[PDB]
Amino acid sequence: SGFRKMAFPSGKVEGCMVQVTCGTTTLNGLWLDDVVYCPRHVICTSEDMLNPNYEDLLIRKSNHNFLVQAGNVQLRVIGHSMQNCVLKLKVDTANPKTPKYKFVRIQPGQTFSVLACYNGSPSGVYQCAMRPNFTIKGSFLNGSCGSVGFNIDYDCVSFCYMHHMELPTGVHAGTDLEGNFYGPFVDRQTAQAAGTDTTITVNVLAWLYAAVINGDRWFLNRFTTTLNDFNLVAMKYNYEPLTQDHVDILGPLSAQTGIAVLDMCASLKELLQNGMNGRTILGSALLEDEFTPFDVVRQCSG
Amino acid sequence: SGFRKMAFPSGKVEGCMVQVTCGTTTLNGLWLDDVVYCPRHVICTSEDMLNPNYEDLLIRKSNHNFLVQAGNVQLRVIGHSMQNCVLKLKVDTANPKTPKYKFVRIQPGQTFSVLACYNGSPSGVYQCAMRPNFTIKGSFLNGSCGSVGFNIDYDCVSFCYMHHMELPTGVHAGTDLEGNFYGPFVDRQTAQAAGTDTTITVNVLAWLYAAVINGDRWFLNRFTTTLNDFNLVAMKYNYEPLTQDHVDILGPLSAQTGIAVLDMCASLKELLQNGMNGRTILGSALLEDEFTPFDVVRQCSG
Ligand SMILES: O=C(Cc1cncc2ccccc12)N(Cc1cc(F)cc(Cl)c1)c1ccc(-c2c[nH]cn2)cc1
Numbered sequence A, B: 001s002g003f004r005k006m007a008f009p010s011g012k013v014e015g016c017m018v019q020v021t022c023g024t025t026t027l028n029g030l031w032l033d034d035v036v037y038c039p040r041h042v043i044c045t046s047e048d049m050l051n052p053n054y055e056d057l058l059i060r061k062s063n064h065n066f067l068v069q070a071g072n073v074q075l076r077v078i079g080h081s082m083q084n085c086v087l088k089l090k091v092d093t094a095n096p097k098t099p100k101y102k103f104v105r106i107q108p109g110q111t112f113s114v115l116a117c118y119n120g121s122p123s124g125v126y127q128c129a130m131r132p133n134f135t136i137k138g139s140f141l142n143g144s145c146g147s148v149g150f151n152i153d154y155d156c157v158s159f160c161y162m163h164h165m166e167l168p169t170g171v172h173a174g175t176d177l178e179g180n181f182y183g184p185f186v187d188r189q190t191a192q193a194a195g196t197d198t199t200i201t202v203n204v205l206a207w208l209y210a211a212v213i214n215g216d217r218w219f220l221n222r223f224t225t226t227l228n229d230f231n232l233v234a235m236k237y238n239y240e241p242l243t244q245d246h247v248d249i250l251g252p253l254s255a256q257t258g259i260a261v262l263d264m265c266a267s268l269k270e271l272l273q274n275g276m277n278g279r280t281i282l283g284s285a286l287l288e289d290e291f292t293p294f295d296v297v298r299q300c301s302g
């Protein structure tokens, strides 16, 4: 037992991280098969990033302008194209360490592991969630761009995130592996508004279920509620509206604990309305929304 | 910027995790060079674990009683010895993937990454601290035994932890890689008292420094204090006594932020005496003690 924020093992992804330089700028790339993926603002100078013309900048660029390094082994670029906001550099050598992989575009609420990298060398690994406003609250310094987020199913790495930038508010934004930004964001250094950041209600219910599973029971109460009454309270407290699908997905944990989803909701309503009164739940004095129901099952089942 | 609980990349360790079976019991082993290390209670049945005679159980054991698996590749055991509470099984094959490694015995307060494994297959990775009472608050189900904790310096894996058991209180205990339990603990399933669990004061100061580094300033006050006055408050609140060495080690962060250690202590005294009044620090409503000053520098410097 016990319950921690846990990242996927990062080995399969470590062996695809490469260093990518263009002129003076260096950032991280992901080498899969004979293609390196990386953020397209690698072709910018610091002057360029306020209002870059990516077509015009890329036209001044030849294959031999892209330096791609893999430890000390270094790749010859033979093709280069821009797909939305990513560079796809065709290289002569297929990655011997390519896992079985897939590109996927996750949904707000869903979680993934980030392998934070600098100069193509892995530095650390942590789990984070795609917030409802399509930002992520991560840990990224300059040069981390091109780091990726990913889940692992058995043997298959599903790449969902590539890091592009830090908004002036100090949160983070990036694309899927086809170059489409999550959220309304653009890759120029400007003032960009994220939306209101609501709380991912279903995750919070999953986290309460993990709490009961690991001994923390003090918040189980004697009330029930309806889904609509709970949704009223939820929107009062800027929570995501809870739908029938969310109740379905919480089904398994409801069954293993013997606690009906709607009674967990009554518990959570009482916590939103009264606080926690200085108590703690799984060693936190806040309500945690970064565990999906699948994350709780995978941790509580092995 | 941003600040997260971040684990080392786990690849170098993944390639040493193996499966180890003896009779009916299976757990995880660490294969380095031509030696597999694993917990010695692998030689027990469920009956045996209340009062095991490890010498007498091991004498009924031959090399061919230990099944060591590496994915599907399987190792022939040629030697076996018991060192304190670990089995060292000499195998014919050296691990092609052996990193440069070292065995180290960390100190309370220090942190490491755990690669939680089942049946020799890695499941997840997370960062945790050796508590002052030599337990760790981890995430371990039955079968995780033999999982290891480790730090990485450049290219060198320093193994410090191997997981043996869960105390009935739901916290976790284990050994260094020579088989010496951290803490007063024994590998029999009995009621074992851990000490009082104090808070690792120096880590809390490091975490406040990371907080200021990332924009959270609301807790900087206008008071100062002495080291002895602060130690009085600290022991009132069951904190680790803060020593000159701790002030030294906090030096670098004091310099980068321009905030004198003793003024950070005055801040922390005021937080211990008044709470946080519903505010948050780096997205937590508790005082976090699981970042060492080195962890803060490594995250805030890349
Ligand atoms: O944020 C970033 C990157 C970034 C990401 N993560 C954490 C960071 C931490 C500190 C500093 C930068 C970080 N930017 C700025 C930026 C770029 C955009 F595309 C859109 C926006 Cl809103 C803002 C960046 C991007 C490119 C460059 C650049 C290109 N070649 C030379 N330099 C330089 C800066």
Ligand SMILES: O=C(Cc1cncc2ccccc12)N(Cc1cc(F)cc(Cl)c1)c1ccc(-c2c[nH]cn2)cc1
Binding pocket: A001, B025, B041, B042, B043, B044, B045, B046, B049, B140, B141, B142, B143, B144, B145, B164, B165, B166, B167, B168, B186, B187, B188, B189, B190, B191, B192
């Ligand atoms: O705790 C554990 C292991 C354990 C570790 N982590 C998380 C766990 C989560 C759930 C269950 C067990 C977990 N034990 C019991 C135990 C062993 C000791 F050595 C000392 C103590 Cl105080 C307690 C264990 C050890 C060995 C065995 C066993 C051997 N062969 C057949 N079975 C069976 C059980």
